[PDB]
Short mmCIF file of C-alpha atoms in Angstrom, two decimals:
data_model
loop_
_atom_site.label_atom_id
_atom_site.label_comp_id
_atom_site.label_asym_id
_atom_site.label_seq_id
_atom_site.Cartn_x
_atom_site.Cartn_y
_atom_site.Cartn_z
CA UNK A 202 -12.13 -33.78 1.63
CA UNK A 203 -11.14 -30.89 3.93
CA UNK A 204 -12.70 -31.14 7.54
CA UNK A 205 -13.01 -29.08 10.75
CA UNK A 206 -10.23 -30.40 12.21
CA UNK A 207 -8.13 -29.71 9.43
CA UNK A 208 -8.81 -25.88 9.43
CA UNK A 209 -8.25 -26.20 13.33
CA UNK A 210 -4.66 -27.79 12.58
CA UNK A 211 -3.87 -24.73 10.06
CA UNK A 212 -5.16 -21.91 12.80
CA UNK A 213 -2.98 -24.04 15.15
CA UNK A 214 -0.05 -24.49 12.86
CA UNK A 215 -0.27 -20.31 11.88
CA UNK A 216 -0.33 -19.51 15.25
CA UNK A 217 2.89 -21.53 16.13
CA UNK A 218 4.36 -19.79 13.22
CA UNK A 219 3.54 -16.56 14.86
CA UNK A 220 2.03 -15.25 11.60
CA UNK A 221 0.04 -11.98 12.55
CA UNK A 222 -3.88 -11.97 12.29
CA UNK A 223 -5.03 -9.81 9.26
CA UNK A 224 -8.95 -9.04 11.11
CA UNK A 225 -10.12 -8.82 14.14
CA UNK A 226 -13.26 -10.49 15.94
CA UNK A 227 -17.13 -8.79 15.10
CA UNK A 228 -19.30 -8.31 18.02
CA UNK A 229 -23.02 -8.78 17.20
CA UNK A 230 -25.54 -6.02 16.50
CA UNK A 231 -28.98 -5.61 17.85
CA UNK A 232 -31.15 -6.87 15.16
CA UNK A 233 -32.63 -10.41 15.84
CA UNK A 234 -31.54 -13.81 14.22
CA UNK A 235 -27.34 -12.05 14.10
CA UNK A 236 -24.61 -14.02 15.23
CA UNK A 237 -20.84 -12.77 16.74
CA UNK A 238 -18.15 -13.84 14.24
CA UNK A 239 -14.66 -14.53 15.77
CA UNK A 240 -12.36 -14.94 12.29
CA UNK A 241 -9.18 -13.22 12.43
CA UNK A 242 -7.80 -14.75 8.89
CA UNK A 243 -8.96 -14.75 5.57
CA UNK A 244 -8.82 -17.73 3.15
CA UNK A 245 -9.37 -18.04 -0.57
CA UNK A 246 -11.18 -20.53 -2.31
CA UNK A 247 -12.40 -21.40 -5.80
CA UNK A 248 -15.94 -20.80 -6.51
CA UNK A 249 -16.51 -24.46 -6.57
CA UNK A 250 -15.65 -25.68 -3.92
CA UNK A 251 -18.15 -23.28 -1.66
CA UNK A 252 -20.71 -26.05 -1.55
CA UNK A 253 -18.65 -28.43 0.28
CA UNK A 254 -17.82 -25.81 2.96
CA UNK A 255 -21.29 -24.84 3.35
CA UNK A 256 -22.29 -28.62 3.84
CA UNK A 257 -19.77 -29.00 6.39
CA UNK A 258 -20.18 -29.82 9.74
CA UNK A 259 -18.76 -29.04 13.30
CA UNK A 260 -17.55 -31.24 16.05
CA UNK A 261 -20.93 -31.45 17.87
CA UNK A 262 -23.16 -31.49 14.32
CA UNK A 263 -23.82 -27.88 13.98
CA UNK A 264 -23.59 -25.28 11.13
CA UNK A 265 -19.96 -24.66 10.41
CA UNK A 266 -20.21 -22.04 7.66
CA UNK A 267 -21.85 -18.71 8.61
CA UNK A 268 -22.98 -16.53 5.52
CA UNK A 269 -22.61 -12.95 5.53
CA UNK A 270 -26.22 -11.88 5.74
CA UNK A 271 -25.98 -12.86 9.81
CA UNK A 272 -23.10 -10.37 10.74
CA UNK A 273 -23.24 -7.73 7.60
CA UNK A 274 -24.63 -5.52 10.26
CA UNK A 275 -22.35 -4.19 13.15
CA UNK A 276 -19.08 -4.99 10.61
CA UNK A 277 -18.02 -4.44 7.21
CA UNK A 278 -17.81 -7.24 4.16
CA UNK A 279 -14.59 -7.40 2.52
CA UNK A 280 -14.65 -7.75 -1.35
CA UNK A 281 -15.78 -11.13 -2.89
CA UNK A 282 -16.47 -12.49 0.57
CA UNK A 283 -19.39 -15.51 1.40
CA UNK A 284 -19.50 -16.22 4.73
CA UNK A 285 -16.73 -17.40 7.59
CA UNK A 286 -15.45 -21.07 9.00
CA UNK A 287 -13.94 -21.20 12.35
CA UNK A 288 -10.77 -18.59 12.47
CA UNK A 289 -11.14 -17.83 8.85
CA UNK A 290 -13.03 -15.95 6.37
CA UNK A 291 -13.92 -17.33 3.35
CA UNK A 292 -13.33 -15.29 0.25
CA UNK A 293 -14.42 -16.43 -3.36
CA UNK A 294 -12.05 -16.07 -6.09
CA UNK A 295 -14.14 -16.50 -9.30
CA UNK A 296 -10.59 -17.17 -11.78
CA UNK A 297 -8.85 -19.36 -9.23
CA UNK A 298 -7.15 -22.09 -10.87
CA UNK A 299 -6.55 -25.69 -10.37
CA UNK A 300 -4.41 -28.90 -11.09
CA UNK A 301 -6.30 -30.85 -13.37
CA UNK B 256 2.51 21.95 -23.98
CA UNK B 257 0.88 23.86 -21.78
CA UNK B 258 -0.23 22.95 -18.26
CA UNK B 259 -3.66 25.18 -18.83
CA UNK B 260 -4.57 23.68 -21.35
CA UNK B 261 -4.61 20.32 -19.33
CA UNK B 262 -8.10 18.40 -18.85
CA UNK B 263 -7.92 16.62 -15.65
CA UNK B 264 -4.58 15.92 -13.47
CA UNK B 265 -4.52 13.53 -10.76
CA UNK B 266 -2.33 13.20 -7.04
CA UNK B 267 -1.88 10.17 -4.98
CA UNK B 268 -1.53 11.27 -1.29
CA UNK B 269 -1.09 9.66 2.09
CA UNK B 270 -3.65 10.68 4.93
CA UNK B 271 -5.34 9.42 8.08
CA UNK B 272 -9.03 9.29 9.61
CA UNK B 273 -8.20 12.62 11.50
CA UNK B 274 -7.63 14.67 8.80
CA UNK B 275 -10.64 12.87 6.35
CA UNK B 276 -12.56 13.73 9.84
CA UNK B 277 -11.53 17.12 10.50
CA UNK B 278 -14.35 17.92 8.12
CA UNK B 279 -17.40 16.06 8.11
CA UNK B 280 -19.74 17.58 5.97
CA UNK B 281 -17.52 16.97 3.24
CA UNK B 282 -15.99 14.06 3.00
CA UNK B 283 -19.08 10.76 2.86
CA UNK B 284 -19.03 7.70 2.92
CA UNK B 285 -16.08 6.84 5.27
CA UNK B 286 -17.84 3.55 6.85
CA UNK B 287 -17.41 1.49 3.66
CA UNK B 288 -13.73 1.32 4.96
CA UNK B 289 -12.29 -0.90 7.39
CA UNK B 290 -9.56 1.13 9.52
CA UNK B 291 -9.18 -2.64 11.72
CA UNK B 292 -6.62 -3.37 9.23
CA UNK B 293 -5.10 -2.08 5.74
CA UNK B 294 -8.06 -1.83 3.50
CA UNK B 295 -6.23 -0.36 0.82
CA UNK B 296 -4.04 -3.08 0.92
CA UNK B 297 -2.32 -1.85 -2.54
CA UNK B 298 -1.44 1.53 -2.73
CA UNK B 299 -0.74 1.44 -6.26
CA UNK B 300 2.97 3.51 -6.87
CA UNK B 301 2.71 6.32 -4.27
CA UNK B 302 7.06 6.25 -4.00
CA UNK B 303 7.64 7.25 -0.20
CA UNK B 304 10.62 7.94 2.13
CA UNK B 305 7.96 6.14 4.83
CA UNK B 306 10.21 2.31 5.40
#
């Protein structure tokens, strides 16, 4: 089951392969309970397996997954997206497939 | 066969946020948009010289 530090290896990895970054970083807005969201990548998942990533956890046991109620102010939603893990930005696919 | 008698006709053009802002009053809606990167990232046939 995918972890933190595996989606720190992949930022790490892209980076080495100098891939450019597709965003850039949101700086918060004014309203209370709104949080600054530095994701410069965008990922896609299937629509089941958004439950795992919003149980997941960080390296000292907080929140990992931010939904997209916190930052919709003070920067724009892309299409399909449901909140943002580390460096990325998580973007639901609803026909993704699968190996079965 | 005859252009007048033509219903609707539609262009596919190539423009920046100066010219969409060198009016204001009418063009709306422009924040939707993300100018950070490519948000229309398809620009569906549009055949250009630009590389």
């Amino acid at each position: 089951v995918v972890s933190y530090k595996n989606l720190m290896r992949l930022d790490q990895i892209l980076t080495e392969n100098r891939t450019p970054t597709q965003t850039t970083i949101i700086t918060g807005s004014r309203m209370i309970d709104t949080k600054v969201i530095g994701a410069t990548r965008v990922m896609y998942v299937g629509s089941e397996l958004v439950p795992e990533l919003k149980a997941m956890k960080d390296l000292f046991g907080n929140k990992a997954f931010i939904e997209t109620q916190h930052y919709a102010d003070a920067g724009t939603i892309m299409n399909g997206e449901v909140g943002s893990i580390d460096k990325f930005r998580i973007i639901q696919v609803p026909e993704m497939l699968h190996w079965a | 066969g005859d252009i007048n008698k033509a219903m609707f006709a539609i262009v596919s053009f190539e423009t920046c946020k100066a010219d969409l802002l060198k009016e204001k009053d009418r063009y709306h809606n422009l924040n939707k948009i993300d100018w950070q990167s490519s948000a229309p990232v398809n620009e569906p046939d549009h055949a250009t010289t630009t590389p």
